[PDB]
Amino acid sequence: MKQIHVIDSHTGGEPTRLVMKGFPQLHGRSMAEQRDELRELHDRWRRACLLEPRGNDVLVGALYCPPVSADATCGVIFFNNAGYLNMCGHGTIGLVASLQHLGLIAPGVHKIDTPVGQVSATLHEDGAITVANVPSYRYRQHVAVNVPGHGVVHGDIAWGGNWFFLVAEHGQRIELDNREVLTEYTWAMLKALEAQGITGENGAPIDHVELFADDPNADSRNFVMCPGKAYDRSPCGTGTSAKLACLAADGTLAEGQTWVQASITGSQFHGRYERDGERIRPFITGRAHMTADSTLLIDEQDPFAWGI
Amino acid sequence: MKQIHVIDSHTGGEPTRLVMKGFPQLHGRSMAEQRDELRELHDRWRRACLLEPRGNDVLVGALYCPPVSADATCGVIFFNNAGYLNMCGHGTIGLVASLQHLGLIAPGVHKIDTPVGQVSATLHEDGAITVANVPSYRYRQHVAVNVPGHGVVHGDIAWGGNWFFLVAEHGQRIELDNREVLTEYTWAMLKALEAQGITGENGAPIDHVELFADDPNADSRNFVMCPGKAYDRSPCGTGTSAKLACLAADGTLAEGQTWVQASITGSQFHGRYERDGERIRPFITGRAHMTADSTLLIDEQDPFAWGI
Questions:
Q1: Which of B11, B25, B224, B227 is deepest in the core (most CB within 10 A)?
Q2: What are the structural domains of chain B?
């Protein structure tokens, strides 16, 4: 049987499967070329890890690769059960925590090469990991949208690496056991935004919604609806970056000050920002925890060895 | 970090997570008492293995236990993300194949103690595993049901350890990429059976539907709808036992003759029967394949260590 060494972890509930050994050798010079090789030459390996029976719809996989950039700790390629991804915030935190667990890196700054550019992560002594997110901003504020079955609510339109509609006052219970109701509400909201012609800058579709509520143990708790009608188990890196931009624009949060954002599952990120013209530079700090050190077993006599 | 040694496998696509080491010691004398202990004293261990992030809705877990009966190979307790189960056909095959893989048993007969009684499995030299299923029979034949959106179809009502409605002529494409359509059709059929007062013996609800179609590589291919609107990835042990009873009652299959039943995923079981009065004794032979040899890692500093 073929063996794939993987470390499974989660980042605030959002899982990552990191492949440490067992995929074919990639020969491309750039991470983009290496991703093309996986996709064009070796796609059964993704499938073995991500399709049933070994994977499911929520999992993101990550292939550990040697660094390409002279200043990089490693390279990584992200993928899911449908195909290949570009960047992955939660998976990058999972990567760094996993390499720490395996004794391959120590605390400090780690530059990670991805197929679409480099990401910077700082591993702290205590295991928390800070990632520099993309320049973020609020585009419009307190925008009215009529959600069928609910009436008008207001939200901010903001960019944090994706376009988000951010809503404080929605009348919904932000608790995990209410996730089905929240899913239907936010999906209806996404459709209403589209129908009412509410977009990001230059007509960009708003494809994520985040709802916010008070929390006794954090500055806020959210519910984050994503493409494919999927919710994020974590506070969402890009979504929390967009939140930071709105807090900054309202004057609620000062430069350098910590914001503690909880998720629908109760996991938390810390966020901070600095100013860069008409954008902010957001910093998201979170944790990943190990969930399994596994040898995936690929039985050559199994018709489903490489997935169903 | 606490460690749980598990072997993950699948039986025709239906997955099993077998816990070999790391759960608390159970002190009950019977398997029923041991299941009560897990549930009442140690339920976080099931949760760590079956809730997110480590598990999902399709997985069944199995705890390996020392045998209770003098003639038993081992005991087992089955569970899922909702609670504890009684017996589990696919999980029993997974258990036996996993113990073979670990060199804990060899080919031959193996009696397995469960919380609700003993099951008998024969491990063959070539790895196939034959399980004696419960006495099965057809209750009514070619029963009309009007399925909304489709009109009248006919099916058999039969018991194989559960009550099934078995349909040959349904006009549906039995292929995995059509599973959503098949799910809606079979769920509508289950509701129509109920509405039209079509039951098993003594009013028992029919809670499974199986659709059958010709297959170029087997005697038949099925789609099996189960409680919770879940489909079986395998041909289904109890469902194939019910199929054997209908084949027997029609004279399609003779005593001792092999029937090859494929599933929606293309996996296959072999079935044979013998006669016992107004019941048949079915024998289902299938295979499990290993998918991972894993150490689940329970980080005491992780709020989701024991599941979300």
A1: B11
A2: 1-133+287-308 (3.10.310.10), 134-286 (3.10.310.10)
